[PDB]
């Protein structure tokens, strides 16, 4: 609620405004473990819960109930993440899930179907992912059409900022949480494919952690 005390080097550097923008943090791939980092730099992040389902566990007296929550975060202009956490009560489960969802924000790569008009609108390539009997497909699409996908994954693609894509599913899609995790992996792999336009050699620069001096 009140002003936070940094625990890691990144918290102090961000609090002092010693770092320029988020893009070098993504370039250097440093782990994030403190949720004030994302919301200090990226306001107006909308979050969205799927559904809540009870989970049981037997005991001598009888049973015992736990609650599982599904939550994803995104800003509709290239940042998305999700988190999974269970607790004995909904309010705790949702709040902690929101925290981990913020911790799990990832960027997406867009592009132009066919000819280029600027205003990136579709995927550069076709990508798909599988996680334990669930496979999700993303296909580049021409400008203008709506989203062709299931109602569950339509929200995730809407919140990813992608406007046109084609989708195809296979396997046992009945596990909605697993389907969402597969979609998140498919969107996560957009920057992992080496297109010919990255053939030019890039210059290596020293990291901010090494070249900055932290406070006492």
């Amino acid at each position: 609620e009140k002003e936070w005390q940094p625990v890691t080097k990144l918290g102090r550097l961000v609090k002092a405004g010693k770092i320029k923008s988020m893009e070098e943090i993504y370039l250097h791939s440093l782990p994030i473990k403190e949720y004030q980092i994302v919301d200090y730099f990226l306001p107006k992040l909308k979050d969205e819960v799927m559904k809540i389902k009870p989970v049981q566990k037997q005991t001598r007296a009888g049973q015992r109930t736990r609650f599982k929550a599904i939550v994803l975060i995104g800003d509709s202009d290239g940042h998305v993440g999700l988190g999974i956490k269970t607790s004995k009560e909904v309010a705790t489960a949702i709040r902690a899930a929101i925290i981990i969802a913020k911790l799990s924000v990832i960027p997406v790569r867009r592009g132009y179907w066919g000819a280029n008009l600027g205003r990136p609108h579709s995927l550069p390539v076709k990508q798909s992912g599988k996680c334990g009997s669930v496979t999700v497909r993303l296909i580049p699409a021409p400008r203008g059409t709506s989203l062709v996908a299931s109602p569950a994954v339509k929200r995730l693609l809407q919140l990813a900022g992608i406007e046109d894509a084609y989708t195809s599913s296979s396997g046992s899609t009945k596990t909605l949480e697993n389907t969402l995790k597969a979609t998140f992996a498919a969107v996560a792999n957009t920057y992992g494919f080496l297109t010919p336009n990255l053939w030019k050699e890039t210059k290596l620069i020293r990291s901010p952690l090494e070249e900055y001096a932290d406070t006492l």
Binding site: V49, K53, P54, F67, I94, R155
Partner: peptide, 21 residues
């Protein structure tokens, strides 16, 4: 069966925000 507190949560947004008659 977690449907007791959705009436006055305001701390999260559900998928099908239940419209009221």
């Amino acid at each position: 069966e977690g449907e007791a507190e959705l009436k006055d949560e305001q701390a999260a947004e559900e998928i099908a925000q239940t419209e009221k008659k």
